Scaffold this active site. Sequence first.
Site, PDB file in Angstrom:
ATOM      1  N   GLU A  50       0.855  -1.189   0.115  1.00  0.00           N
ATOM      2  CA  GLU A  50      -0.061   0.015  -0.025  1.00  0.00           C
ATOM      3  C   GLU A  50       0.947   1.026  -0.056  1.00  0.00           C
ATOM      4  O   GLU A  50       0.450   2.156  -0.477  1.00  0.00           O
ATOM      5  CB  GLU A  50      -0.963   0.063   1.378  1.00  0.00           C
ATOM      6  CG  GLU A  50      -2.062   1.051   1.086  1.00  0.00           C
ATOM      7  CD  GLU A  50      -3.230   0.883   0.154  1.00  0.00           C
ATOM      8  OE1 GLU A  50      -3.154  -0.343  -0.029  1.00  0.00           O
ATOM      9  OE2 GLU A  50      -3.702   1.809  -0.590  1.00  0.00           O
ATOM     10  N   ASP A 109      -4.954   7.929  -5.326  1.00  0.00           N
ATOM     11  CA  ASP A 109      -4.727   6.582  -5.320  1.00  0.00           C
ATOM     12  C   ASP A 109      -4.712   6.124  -6.794  1.00  0.00           C
ATOM     13  O   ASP A 109      -4.890   6.820  -7.870  1.00  0.00           O
ATOM     14  CB  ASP A 109      -5.728   5.671  -4.643  1.00  0.00           C
ATOM     15  CG  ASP A 109      -6.965   6.080  -4.560  1.00  0.00           C
ATOM     16  OD1 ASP A 109      -7.275   6.890  -5.671  1.00  0.00           O
ATOM     17  OD2 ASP A 109      -7.784   5.133  -4.033  1.00  0.00           O
ATOM     18  N   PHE A 166      -9.264  -4.352   2.995  1.00  0.00           N
ATOM     19  CA  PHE A 166      -8.809  -3.126   3.175  1.00  0.00           C
ATOM     20  C   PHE A 166      -8.797  -2.100   2.003  1.00  0.00           C
ATOM     21  O   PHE A 166      -8.872  -0.899   2.130  1.00  0.00           O
ATOM     22  CB  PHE A 166      -7.386  -3.185   3.593  1.00  0.00           C
ATOM     23  CG  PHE A 166      -6.630  -1.982   3.873  1.00  0.00           C
ATOM     24  CD1 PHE A 166      -6.550  -1.304   5.007  1.00  0.00           C
ATOM     25  CD2 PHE A 166      -5.736  -1.262   2.810  1.00  0.00           C
ATOM     26  CE1 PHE A 166      -5.752  -0.041   5.431  1.00  0.00           C
ATOM     27  CE2 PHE A 166      -4.899  -0.222   3.287  1.00  0.00           C
ATOM     28  CZ  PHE A 166      -5.100   0.236   4.253  1.00  0.00           C
ATOM     29  N   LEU A 178      -8.391   6.147   2.605  1.00  0.00           N
ATOM     30  CA  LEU A 178      -9.156   7.002   1.889  1.00  0.00           C
ATOM     31  C   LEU A 178      -9.840   7.980   2.637  1.00  0.00           C
ATOM     32  O   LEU A 178     -10.302   7.982   3.528  1.00  0.00           O
ATOM     33  CB  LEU A 178     -10.387   6.252   1.402  1.00  0.00           C
ATOM     34  CG  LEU A 178     -11.355   6.547   0.250  1.00  0.00           C
ATOM     35  CD1 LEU A 178     -10.583   7.016  -1.111  1.00  0.00           C
ATOM     36  CD2 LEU A 178     -12.492   5.659   0.015  1.00  0.00           C
ATOM     37  N   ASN A 200      -9.804 -18.026 -10.081  1.00  0.00           N
ATOM     38  CA  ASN A 200     -10.779 -17.119 -10.011  1.00  0.00           C
ATOM     39  C   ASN A 200     -10.433 -15.739  -9.602  1.00  0.00           C
ATOM     40  O   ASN A 200     -11.213 -14.593  -9.938  1.00  0.00           O
ATOM     41  CB  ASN A 200     -12.105 -17.649  -9.458  1.00  0.00           C
ATOM     42  CG  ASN A 200     -12.829 -18.663 -10.197  1.00  0.00           C
ATOM     43  OD1 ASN A 200     -13.043 -18.649 -11.281  1.00  0.00           O
ATOM     44  ND2 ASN A 200     -13.275 -19.816  -9.438  1.00  0.00           N
ATOM     45  N   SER A 231     -14.666 -17.661  -5.427  1.00  0.00           N
ATOM     46  CA  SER A 231     -13.549 -17.666  -4.705  1.00  0.00           C
ATOM     47  C   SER A 231     -13.623 -17.616  -3.308  1.00  0.00           C
ATOM     48  O   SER A 231     -12.883 -18.531  -2.528  1.00  0.00           O
ATOM     49  CB  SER A 231     -12.705 -16.473  -5.237  1.00  0.00           C
ATOM     50  OG  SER A 231     -12.628 -16.366  -6.461  1.00  0.00           O
TER      51      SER A 231
END
EC number: 3.2.1.17
Length: 440
Positions: free
Chosen positions: A210, A219, A303, A231, A331, A316
Amino acid sequence: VWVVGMGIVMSLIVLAIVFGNVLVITAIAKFERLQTVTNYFITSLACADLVMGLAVVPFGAAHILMKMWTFGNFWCEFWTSIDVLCVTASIETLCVIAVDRYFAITSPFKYQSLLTKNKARVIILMVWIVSGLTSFLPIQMHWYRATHQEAINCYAEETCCDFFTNQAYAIASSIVSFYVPLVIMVFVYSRVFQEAKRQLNIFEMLRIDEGLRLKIYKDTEGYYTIGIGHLLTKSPSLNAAKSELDKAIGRNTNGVITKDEAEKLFNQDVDAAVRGILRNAKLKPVYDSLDAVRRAALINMVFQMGETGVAGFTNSLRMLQQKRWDEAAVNLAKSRWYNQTPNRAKRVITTFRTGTWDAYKFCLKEHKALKTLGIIMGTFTLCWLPFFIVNIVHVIQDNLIRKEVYILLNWIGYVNSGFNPLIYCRSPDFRIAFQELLCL
Ligand SMILES: CC(C)CCC[C@@H](C)[C@H]1CC[C@H]2[C@@H]3CC=C4C[C@@H](O)CC[C@]4(C)[C@H]3CC[C@]12C
Ligand SMILES: CC(C)CCC[C@@H](C)[C@H]1CC[C@H]2[C@@H]3CC=C4C[C@@H](O)CC[C@]4(C)[C@H]3CC[C@]12C
Ligand SMILES: Nc1nc(Nc2ccccc2)nc2ccc(Br)cc12
Ligand SMILES: C=CCc1ccccc1OC[C@@H](O)CNC(C)C
């Protein structure tokens, strides 16, 4: 004759050793943020390499080129004594580094040395004291002197500085001064790499892929974010992102925050991710049917995308709970998440697929610093271990050693003193420090 070639070669090696290790030394001396506990160890390591290039390698170059010893039996002793001193102090320093990094990586103060600077200075002196006793005393007290005729003729001869030792010295010196700290170094520092890999949580995982910025930025989606992918808002207004920033922090920041209050946001975000995985009924059972490595890889997805976005991977989710990792990993690749940010999705999918931290090896800043210290050690081994294995076999095989094959492998050890500054140019802080000193 053909000697002029080796003279230039050896003269350049003397420069690369001196100029490089004075560069390393001066960078730590003037710059504050390189005045760490580990870099005090590197200071003495560079000194051991610097003295190698000022007192040892030149007089060994004059020995080879002139095919005899110009400087007398007195300097023949110190030259030998200082040479042994610089090699003994180097391996113990690399041994202290490895043990220092072990006690650091096991404490809750991860990556930070438990020793204070004044105490680390006390360690440096003892290393040189113990090295100075195990190096000068056997040479000054003639405990190395062999009893065969060829060695005795070189001993009384002042133009001969051949290094012949009795078998007892060649064993005890190699064991006590080289092999014991080497075996400790290689075992203790392999124990460090194994703790860095074992001690990878979600926090270091996110902070790797990140990133960390202290200034408001856009971003990958263009949304105003700050800190470690926190964010701020999805409105294109900068003050809307600055006003939401100040409401969350409580301080008027004007878009800039410290690292302390950035980790506190990073913790709250990870807490919101775990709480969100537990609130959502579609994510709760899958999170429980996962090990700690894949629990983190799941916290990472929430996240980045949120609870409702991660719950869309209905197939998944069923497979990760069925523990069908390779099938879930496919997947996870057939999604548009792997499209927008592939490098991050790769590391997360592989973390689900393999259940290990191989996708994040040496990706964290502090792990790259350890890998740097693992290269100066692995290089020190490959430069001196051939020399020391040939000494230990020379004694057992009882045949006298080939004077050119012997001195050869000692010069592979000599060129070690010029390798440390380049491995330090592999650190970002030394590059910025070297460029200032070089005024580039
Ligand atoms: C030429 C040979 C025989 C002698 C050289 C050994 C002595 C003088 C040198 C080599 C490396 C040096 C150390 C290198 C590291 C520094 C860290 C600094 O913060 C305080 C001094 C200290 C701890 C130095 C003390 C003196 C030292 C031990
Ligand atoms: C026979 C000859 C080679 C002996 C001379 C040894 C020289 C190279 C040694 C002796 C004392 C050493 C110094 C001891 C003090 C430290 C302070 C540290 O912050 C930077 C390195 C520095 C400045 C060392 C550099 C190397 C040094 C100057
Ligand atoms: N050469 C040697 N270095 C070191 N350093 C060291 C420092 C802290 C922890 C581990 C090792 N120790 C030795 C112990 C016995 C014998 Br024998 C030799 C050594
Ligand atoms: C068998 C002794 C070899 C040795 C043991 C411990 C420390 C250093 C040792 O050797 C270093 C060489 O650089 C010295 N070789 C001579 C002095 C030319």
